[PDB]
Amino acid sequence: DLTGYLDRINYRGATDPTLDVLRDLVSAHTGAIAFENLDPLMGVPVDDLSAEALADKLVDRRRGGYCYEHNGLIGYVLAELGYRVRRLAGRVVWLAPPDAPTPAQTHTVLAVTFPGCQGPYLVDVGFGGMTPTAPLRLETGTVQQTALEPYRLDDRGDGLVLQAMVRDEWQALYEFSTLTRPQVDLRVGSWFVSTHPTSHFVTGLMAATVADDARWNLMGRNLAIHRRGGTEKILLEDAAAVVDTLGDRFGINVADVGERGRLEARIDKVCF
């Protein structure tokens, strides 16, 4: 399904398994396919992580997705290109203090290698609003400036913790083990996050995309545009404007979700 995907992320673009191509794929992907949880919000589970089902939705149907869908899809792409891809699981610690309760293992990221690589790279195009938009060296200590925030991995345990400087503060994003996880364990986690009544992807709306050189982040009716020298915040007026924004700014094929009236009613109930 490769050409369809390359067209959808508008990549144009050498295709060898190199570090340059990996950077360009990650920028293109993050620039093109939104993060969104319209499926779980509308009571539709994310239960099929195969290459076909994720391409059908994120490519053919011009929908976005969440972590399992994003890193699912890009993982299959990269493998097809001649990268070696290992799927990893993580726990989200965003904004949480050190004494927070242990979060579920609800995130998935990739450890990626390729011919002539200098060591493994972390690829994560699925952590919505703060997803790194470059592959990162899978090494600790190093401060890694991207097109947006700088990132840094730290040894914690047992595993690693990804941090970024968000506005003016170093923020831990998620902790993860470098142990490969079976596809079945990912499906268990995706089931949880897409169906559990306490899941943040069940109880509210979340969408995120990147431009030059801005993060566009949506939380319910709260739209934030995070640029280099400032953040613009917009309170969307009504469920109708939220859906327009999902289609227009986030590039999501909202018609796929069903009748516009039902999406709106759902967003109004949530959200509103």
Distance CA(80)–CA(160), nearest Å, equals 27
Total H helices, total E strands in the chain: 9, 13
Angle, to 10 degrees, between the axis of helix 67-81 and the axis of helix 183-195?
Answer: 150
DSSP per-residue string spanning 3-28: HHHHHHTT--S--SSSHHHHHHHHHH
Hey, what domains does the chain have and what are their CATH numbers?
Answer: 1-82+183-272 (3.30.2140.10), 83-182 (2.40.128.150)
Phi, psi of 225 (to 5 degrees): -115, 110
Classify the phi-psi angles of 99: left when phi > 0, otherwise alpha if psi is within -120 to 50, otherwise beta. alpha
Distance CA(71)–CA(85), nearest Å, equals 10
3-state SS record for 198-246: CCHHHHCCEEEEECCCCEEEEECCEEEEEECCEEEEEECCCHHHHHHHH
Distance CA(92)–CA(101), nearest Å, equals 11
Distance CA(95)–CA(90), nearest Å, equals 15
- DSSP label of 46: -
Q: Which of 29, 39, 70, 107 is catalytic?
A: 107
Residue 107 among the catalytic residues: yes
| Burial category of 174 from C-beta neighbours within 10 Å (exposed 0-12, middle 13-18, buried 19 and up) | buried
Q: Which helix (H) or strand (E) holds 101?
A: none
3-state SS record for 151-170: EEEEEECCEEEEEEEECCEE
Residue 20 among the catalytic residues: no
Residue 7 among the catalytic residues: no
The identity of residue 43, as a single letter, is: G
Q: Which of 29, 70, 124, 226 is catalytic?
A: 124
Radius of gyration of the chain (CA): 18
Q: Which helix (H) or strand (E) holds 268?
A: helix 260-271
Q: Which of 67, 70, 226, 271 is catalytic?
A: 67
Going 198 to 202 to 207 to 208, the CA torsion angle's sign is: positive
Cβ-contact 210, 31 below 8 angstroms: yes
Classify the phi-psi angles of 180: left when phi > 0, otherwise alpha if psi is within -120 to 50, otherwise beta. beta
How many alpha carbons fall within 13 Å on the CB side of residue 235?
2
Classify the phi-psi angles of 95: left when phi > 0, otherwise alpha if psi is within -120 to 50, otherwise beta. left
Say which residues have a Cβ less than 8 Å from residue 14's Cβ, sequence separation at least 6. Answer: 20, 21, 24
Which residues on neighbouring strands pair with residue 54, listed in sequence order?
A: none
| Short-list 34, 41, 33, 39, CA closest to 200 | 41
Give me the resolution in angstroms, 1 decimal: 2.0
The tokens of 42 are what? 């509308």
